[PDB]
Curated annotation (Swiss-Prot):
<feature type="binding site">
    <location>
        <position position="151"/>
    </location>
    <ligand>
        <name>ATP</name>
    </ligand>
</feature>
<dbReference type="InterPro" id="IPR005145">
    <property type="entry name" value="Sua5_C"/>
</dbReference>
<dbReference type="GO" id="GO:0000049">
    <property type="term" value="F:tRNA binding"/>
</dbReference>
<dbReference type="GO" id="GO:0008033">
    <property type="term" value="P:tRNA processing"/>
</dbReference>
<feature type="binding site">
    <location>
        <position position="143"/>
    </location>
    <ligand>
        <name>ATP</name>
    </ligand>
</feature>
<keyword id="KW-0067">ATP-binding</keyword>
<dbReference type="InterPro" id="IPR038385">
    <property type="entry name" value="Sua5/YwlC_C"/>
</dbReference>
<keyword id="KW-0808">Transferase</keyword>
<keyword id="KW-0547">Nucleotide-binding</keyword>
<dbReference type="InterPro" id="IPR017945">
    <property type="entry name" value="DHBP_synth_RibB-like_a/b_dom"/>
</dbReference>
<protein>
    <recommendedName>
        <fullName>Threonylcarbamoyl-AMP synthase</fullName>
        <ecNumber>2.7.7.87</ecNumber>
    </recommendedName>
</protein>
<feature type="binding site">
    <location>
        <position position="194"/>
    </location>
    <ligand>
        <name>ATP</name>
    </ligand>
</feature>
<feature type="binding site">
    <location>
        <position position="141"/>
    </location>
    <ligand>
        <name>L-threonine</name>
    </ligand>
</feature>
<feature type="domain" description="YrdC-like">
    <location>
        <begin position="13"/>
        <end position="198"/>
    </location>
</feature>
<feature type="binding site">
    <location>
        <position position="67"/>
    </location>
    <ligand>
        <name>L-threonine</name>
    </ligand>
</feature>
<comment type="subunit">
    <text>Monomer.</text>
</comment>
<dbReference type="InterPro" id="IPR006070">
    <property type="entry name" value="Sua5-like_dom"/>
</dbReference>
């Protein structure tokens, strides 16, 4: 694998071209975006796209997201787009919002998992946008992590996961938001399939009528305490019988000094928490603890996405009342 260091804010076009040549030749390239790193291939090349599944060992029926750099490309992969959707796409892109649309005959089965629809988005990241532009083709790509690991948010995550399994890894720093793009299905009348950086607050203003057994990393048991008023007592109750790690905001560090902590960021800046979330899960598994205990965050703005990912990561081990603890531990 060729690891190429590229400036994320002012990418060296000659370096981008090296990766683009790989895409055009049917190879795979891991690249940063404003959400999480992606592993991509020529969206029109089914065989190339299968290499993505092979590198991640991803179940073949889990579809990819097609990344475009301009609207001419939108019409190459999607069709029968409602006028309102087109008008809105033109004001939210490039951005962390993915639209599920009706696909064209040019989109391979490998990309859509055989579905009649295709998920599309225009990434708001210079490296991603330039890579697509220089490649001259839309790039299909899911998150760039190995099957059972958290979505990668920094180059090191991708390297540890895919080095030796992909043709190119662009080392482009840490991703901006840290959580995957918001997904909205506009082929029905619309549904929010996944919360993300494009908040539901903003979505409802554009789409007022919007409708709101896989194991998610970490492998270490993880409890999510949504009620902050019982967090201290849940910790006291568990740290007595188990070696724990607390995923908390810096504001609560002093209250639990002595116990293993993984600082997510500040309560005054949820984007910081979102940026550090997946890597905090990776750290939890590197530590030698019986279980992780994460505190909840406000479900406003990106907080909704944070909690959505947190619930999934905890295998839905939500604690609202201290008595709930009985359900996920002795
Ligand atoms: N046609 C589609 N309909 C609904 N969801 C889709 C579709 N295509 C892709 N997706 C979503 O995009 C995800 C892959 O991108 P990623 O979450 O970054 O790995 C899939 O797992 C689905 O959750
Ligand atoms: Mg993924």
């Amino acid at each position: 694998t060729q690891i190429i260091k590229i400036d994320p804010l002012n990418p060296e076009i000659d370096k981008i071209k090296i990766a683009a040549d790989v895409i055009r030749n049917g190879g795979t390239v891991a690249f940063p975006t404003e959400t999480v790193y992606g592993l991509g291939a020529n969206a029109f090349d089914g065989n190339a796209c299968l290499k993505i599944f092979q590198a991640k060992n991803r179940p073949v029926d889990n579809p990819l997201i097609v990344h475009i750099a301009d609207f001419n490309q939108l019409f190459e992969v999607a069709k029968d787009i409602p006028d309102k959707v087109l008008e809105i796409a033109q004001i939210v892109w490039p951005g962390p919002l993915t639209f599920v649309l009706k696909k064209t005959e040019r989109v391979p089965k490998e990309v859509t998992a055989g579905l009649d629809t295709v998920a599309v988005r225009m990434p708001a990241h210079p490296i991603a946008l330039q890579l697509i532009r220089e490649s001259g083709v839309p790039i299909a790509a899911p998150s760039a992590n190995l099957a059972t690991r958290p979505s990668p948010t920094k180059a090191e995550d991708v390297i540890v996961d895919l080095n030796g399994r992909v043709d190119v890894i662009i080392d482009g720093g840490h991703t901006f938001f840290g959580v995957e793009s918001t997904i909205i299905n506009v082929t029905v009348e619309p549904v929010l399939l996944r919360p993300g950086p494009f908040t539901i607050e903003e979505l409802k203003k554009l789409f007022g009528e919007i409708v709101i057994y896989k194991h998610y990393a970490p492998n270490t048991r993880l409890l999510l305490v949504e009620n902050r008023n019982i967090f201290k007592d849940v910790v006291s109750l568990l740290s007595k019988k188990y070696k724990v790690a607390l995923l908390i905001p810096k504001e609560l560090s002093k209250e639990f000094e002595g116990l293993q902590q993984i600082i997510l960021g500040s309560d005054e800046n949820l984007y910081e928490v979102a940026r550090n979330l997946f890597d905090s899960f990776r750290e939890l598994d590197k530590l030698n603890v019986d279980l992780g205990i994460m505190i909840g965050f406000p479900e406003r703005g990106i907080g909704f996405a944070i909690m959505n990912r947190a619930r999934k990561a905890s295998g839905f081990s939500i604690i609202k009342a201290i008595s709930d603890v009985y359900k996920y531990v002795n």
